[PDB]
Amino acid sequence: GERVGILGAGIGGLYSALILQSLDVPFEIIEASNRVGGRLFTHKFPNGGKYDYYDVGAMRYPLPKSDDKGNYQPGVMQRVGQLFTYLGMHKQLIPYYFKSNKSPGFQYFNGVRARIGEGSSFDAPALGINSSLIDIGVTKIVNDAVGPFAQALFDDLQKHTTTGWDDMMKNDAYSTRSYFSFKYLPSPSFGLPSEHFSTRVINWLETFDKSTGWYDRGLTETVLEAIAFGEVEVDWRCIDGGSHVLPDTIAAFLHKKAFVMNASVTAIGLENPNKEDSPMVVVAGGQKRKYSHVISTLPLPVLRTVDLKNSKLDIVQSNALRKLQYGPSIKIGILFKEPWWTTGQDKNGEKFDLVGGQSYTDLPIRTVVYPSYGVNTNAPSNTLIASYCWTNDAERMGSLIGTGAATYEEQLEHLVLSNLAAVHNTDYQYLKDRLVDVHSWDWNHNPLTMGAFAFFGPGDFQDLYTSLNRPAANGKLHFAGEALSVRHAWVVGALDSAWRAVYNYLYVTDPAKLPKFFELWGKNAEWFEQP
Amino acid sequence: GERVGILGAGIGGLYSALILQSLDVPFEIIEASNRVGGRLFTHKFPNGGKYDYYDVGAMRYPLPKSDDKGNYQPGVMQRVGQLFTYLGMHKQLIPYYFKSNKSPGFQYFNGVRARIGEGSSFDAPALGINSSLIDIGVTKIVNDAVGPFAQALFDDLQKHTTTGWDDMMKNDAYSTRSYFSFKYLPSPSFGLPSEHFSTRVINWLETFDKSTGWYDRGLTETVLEAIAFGEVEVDWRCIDGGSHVLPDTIAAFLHKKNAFVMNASVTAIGLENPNKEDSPMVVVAGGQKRKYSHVISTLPLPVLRTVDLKNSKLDIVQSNALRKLQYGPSIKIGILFKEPWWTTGQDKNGEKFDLVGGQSYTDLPIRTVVYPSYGVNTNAPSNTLIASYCWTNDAERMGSLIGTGAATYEEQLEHLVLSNLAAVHNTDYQYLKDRLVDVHSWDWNHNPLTMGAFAFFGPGDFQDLYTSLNRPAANGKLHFAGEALSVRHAWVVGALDSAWRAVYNYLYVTDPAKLPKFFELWGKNAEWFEQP
Ligand SMILES: Cc1cc2c(cc1C)N(C[C@H](O)[C@H](O)[C@H](O)COP(=O)(O)OP(=O)(O)OC[C@H]1O[C@@H](n3cnc4c(N)ncnc43)[C@H](O)[C@@H]1O)c1[nH]c(=O)[nH]c(=O)c1N2
Ligand SMILES: Cc1cc2c(cc1C)N(C[C@H](O)[C@H](O)[C@H](O)COP(=O)(O)OP(=O)(O)OC[C@H]1O[C@@H](n3cnc4c(N)ncnc43)[C@H](O)[C@@H]1O)c1[nH]c(=O)[nH]c(=O)c1N2
Ligand SMILES: N[C@@H](CCC(=O)O)C(=O)O
Ligand SMILES: N[C@@H](CCC(=O)O)C(=O)O
């Protein structure tokens, strides 16, 4: 009969399983490792307390507003909020402070230190940035360029249209950089010369807006991220105890109602590609398993290591698996003896007075994230995310992570602490005396992810994205995972991909279940609807 | 008292040392590791014979023509050739077969297998590539777009001008992709619509021209790379015994004149007193302070970002350049087999591969296969294959399976590579597994000593930030060098050019009376052509 093989016990595969279970469709989940959650990965420090953990992957959720009952207003990540409520986790959501809840975080650029909001220029005039651009500020400039695209895409979601996406796709051959260099012109109200920005100005924008190399990726990703971050209000939330609680709770729910763990997939294909009723065959852990349909949540680079002969990918799908671009990321968590960023003071006696929030710098660590969990408890977290990098910053830092050599582990620690000391204006020894343990992770050096997440280059969305939204293997192989969405690097992207995969499965096997599917999980993947 | 501190015992630092030694300038070389050569790295398989090695980094040199005495004609890499001759290595250079010296290498794209030169379309019509584009071919299309820039830069070198570079810089904000999408129009002789290529066509070009993601990097690098590869004749050469022979020979030459400080990683560089005009330079390496009059750094830009450069007084552009000037990734996988099956073997249908040197290409994860040119005419030909050589996105993805320290992922890596090799050559997996002996793999983007394979600039890097690092720092006493400080990124000549410029600036400010001899031995210019 019908039994769906779900590849990958990440949040996308677990979500697919929730849907199928609610519709009484048999399924199995095949997972290569001994754990569920995938890129929801919470590391707990052995020497710490209840809140001495940090999330190596997902950690913050910009959700729509919600009522006391867990009903979420329409929004980009309503689907995530409704999942929490569905699992009885709404009351386990705690505030995530994107900015500090007390004094503002630090900025350290070009050797100039300041607090967020103090209006420092960070020596930009010495870089050749004229005073008019400095007065306007990076945020307003980028918003003026991204705004028109973002507003059109938000109108698509609110009004149930796709013309905004059509407009984004006519511009999808642009990177953010090439859009500034060859098309964008400043709003006349800025009083700037009606000229395209120079590379010097564009790189100044990237320095404070995103990460080194971000602007060489697709303009569309810049637009989609502004929408995801709510720059188009949102309740920033994290999960009490770490993001691991979400997949662990789903797994425990599915258990009491199967899982095939420690079985890496090496082949996917039809048993007989010339038979219309041929089942699907998945080789996992050296054993053949048969299914009617297969929903894959494996990252695209991982699928490139799987034998997909007899899955009958069309020529566009196979090229898309290779070309659709992924991005890197690293994180470094440090257990300290105390939350010095909250209770301590700098070398001149000035209190940091930081609670949650983030600090930013052009030094290699780039971004520091102070924990929001546990701040209002008897045992606040002593664990800091000392570095969180993207693109070029993550690529370079990755060479110092996971070397297995004590000499490089020591170099890494000294670099991170030194960068931290310069950002916060402390001595190196002040932080070394308080260090307990270090944990680091490079998602671009992990066979299970082969990159942090999808981060498409120019042209990817307009040319190759749609091919993987079609099924393969005579309609019996469905591609899913966060890469199959317009919310890359977000949990909602994985949830959206699972919605589409199950939709196509029901469409071809049992369309009579579509009304119930719509009723429980939404009439659309992205188009807004009330709770 | 002059004494130059050279940071890094790679080919750039060793070359700097050769120059200074020829000019009687005292120097010391500080090296973090226990070896010299840097990205010239030859791996020898212990279970193999004389030619069972492979070069993990540099392996092939497109040199100018040369005479019997080792004099090289003017060209992009004359400087490399003259270095070989200077060291008495000219007769140790052997042919490098860029294409196979017997039957052509393989191409395997979109499930279609063919030999190089057979004119296959690899199912391109099913991708939406119209027949006119296929008939013209990727090579002609890319040459038509790159040609004008490459010709102007080659004229700069021949006629001793910089207008070609100035024109290239006017277009440096383009990536190769954005140039095709928003500016390039086909030559009217192509008979194509006078319109910019679609993304589908541009990605088709990238698939057969370079590597996944190459076209999102700077257009200038694509132009400069075509000049370096000679696509604008060249004698492709490699070094008998491996590229390691070059830095080893330099080291042995310098010792009998020692000034090597090994196992001393640099952690700080700066003036002893930044407010004193006569302040010496201080280098902290291996936990020890060392003082010099001037410092020539050949450390990669990402490595300098891990060094305390306070008191080197970089200007705001230089410090940003260290962060933003982009590097690119690369991996290599070498496999020792029991026999050179690519030369003596046959596919599942009995057709002999008949490959000697050369390369095969595929859109499969391994991307490029390189058959050895060394040893092909000896009693013990090489049994060692470069089963995979990747760039950009292909190298980034493959890197996650390299250096994991887990046997399970070493096995997955081996099975993937062998499976890809079998599909490219039309053999069974077991045919290659039965012949496998040993595997060695390397990811230059997961290596603290390089932090990337080499400079691979994005759009705007050359026009905006490159020049800042061509100026010295630390009151004129810190000189930035290494292959990143050149227009020949990812080439030995780039490192040599950077050393020429660094020593030139050093001599210019400390002892200009040595310039004539410097010009006489090492060239009147870094890049502008001259006769041997
Ligand atoms: C550093 C970092 C930071 C963030 C985020 C990611 C990262 C890397 N994200 C994004 C979010 O973590 C991500 O989009 C989803 O967790 C992806 O879920 P999937 O199910 O698509 O894949 P995921 O990769 O999580 O799951 C795939 C599963 O397949 C398994 N697998 C792999 N190869 C296999 C094989 N051969 N056979 C069988 N199984 C195999 C894996 O082990 C894994 O269990 C995020 N999101 C968010 O909402 N907020 C945030 O703040 C962040 N931040
Ligand atoms: C995979 C691959 C393939 C190729 C090539 C590179 C790579 C990575 N190249 C390019 C060529 O290898 C490269 O451009 C030069 O070797 C670079 O020499 P440098 O001296 O500039 O740096 P390189 O990196 O070689 O040397 C720097 C030195 O500094 C040391 N160091 C690092 N950190 C330090 C610290 N903190 N303190 C002290 N010392 C430190 C390093 O250990 C090293 O000895 C090439 N070229 C070519 O001509 N033909 C080819 O075919 C190829 N192919
Ligand atoms: N969404 C993740 C990853 C970055 C991104 O969204 O692009 C974050 O909040 O950091
Ligand atoms: N030069 C090296 C690296 C690639 C490049 O030059 O860009 C090679 O021949 O493979």
- Residue B266 assigned ligand-binding role: yes
**Cβ B31 under 6 angstroms from ligand 2:** yes
Contacts of B460 in chain A (CB under 8 A): 177, 181, 199, 202-203
Residue-wise DSSP of A224-290? HHHHHTT---EEEEEETT-TTHHHHHHHHHHHT--EE-S--EEEEEES-TT-TTPPEEEEETTEEEE
In a domain, B532, yes or no: no
Burial group, residue A23, by CB count within 10 angstroms (0-12, 13-18, 19+):
middle
State which residues form the domain around B206.
Answer: 137-233
**Cβ B453 under 6 angstroms from ligand 2:** yes
Residue keyed to tokens 């060239």: B523
- Residue A189 and residue A213 in one domain: yes
Specify the number of domains making up chain A. Answer: 2
- Residue A228 and residue A250 in one domain: no
Tell me the C-alpha distance between B512 and B276, whole Å.
23
3-state helix, strand, coil in chain A (%, to 5): 40, 20, 45
- Residue B309 and residue B165 in one domain: no
What atom of ligand 1 comes closest to residue A265's alpha carbon? 37
**Cβ A12 under 6 angstroms from ligand 1:** yes
- Residue B354 and residue B430 in one domain: yes
- Residue A319 and residue A463 in one domain: yes
Contacts of A400 in chain B (CB under 8 A): 306, 448, 451
Pick from B215, B174, B178: nearest CA to B197:
B178
Sign of CA dihedral B42, B48, B50, B52: negative
In a domain, B393, yes or no: yes
Long-range contacts (CB closer than 8 Å, 24 or more residues apart) made by B185-189: B186/B141, B186/B144, B187/B144
- Residue A182 and residue A254 in one domain: no
Tell me the C-alpha distance between A212 and A207, whole Å.
7
In a domain, B109, yes or no: no
Tell me the C-alpha distance between A108 and A361, whole Å.
5
Q: Are B409 and A447 in contact (CB < 8 Å)?
A: yes
- Residue B321 and residue B338 in one domain: no
Tokens, residue B519: 């010009």
First to last CA, chain B: 34
How many A from CA of A480 to the centre of ligand 1?
Answer: 12
User: In this structure, which amino acid lies at residue A463?
Assistant: D
Q: Are A123 and B198 in contact (CB < 8 Å)?
A: no
Side-chain-side CA neighbours of B236 within 13 Å: the count stands at 16
In a domain, B517, yes or no: yes
Pick from B154, B152, B143, B164: nearest CA to B74:
B154
- Residue A169 and residue A217 in one domain: yes
A171 part of contact set with chain B, CB < 8 Å: no
Dmax (CA) for chain B in angstroms is 77
Taking only Cα atoms into account, the Rg of chain A, rounded to an integer number of angstroms, comes to 24
- Residue A226 and residue A156 in one domain: yes
Tell me the C-alpha distance between B361 and A281, whole Å.
30
Q: Which residues of chain A from 314 to 333 reach within 8 Å of chain B, CB to CB?
A: 314-316, 318-319, 322-323, 325-326, 328
Burial group, residue B386, by CB count within 10 angstroms (0-12, 13-18, 19+):
buried
Helical segments of A78-198, H only = 78-86, 131-136, 138-159, 163-170, 176-182
Tell me the C-alpha distance between B285 and B262, whole Å.
10
Tokens, residue A270: 């039809």
Q: How many CB atoms lie within 10 A of CB B22?
A: 15
Q: Among A232, A252, A268, which residue terminates a domain?
A: A232
In a domain, A16, yes or no: yes
In a domain, A297, yes or no: yes
Q: Among A203, A232, A261, which residue terminates a domain?
A: A232
In a domain, B125, yes or no: no
Q: Among A200, A232, A264, which residue terminates a domain?
A: A232
CB B316 within 8 A of CB B376: no
- Residue B477 and residue B338 in one domain: no
The CATH number of whichever domain residue A506 belongs to comes to 3.50.50.60
Q: How many CB pairs under 8 A join A and B?
A: 190
- Residue B435 and residue B340 in one domain: yes
Q: Which residues of chain A from 271 to 310 reach within 8 Å of chain B, CB to CB?
A: 301, 304-305, 307
Residue-wise DSSP of B230-257? T----EEEEETT-TTHHHHHHHHHHHT-
- Residue A145 and residue A225 in one domain: yes
Sign of CA dihedral B124, B125, B127, B130: positive
Q: Specify the resolution in Å.
A: 2.1
Tell me the C-alpha distance between B49 and B437, whole Å.
13
Tokens, residue A207: 């320095």
In a domain, B115, yes or no: no
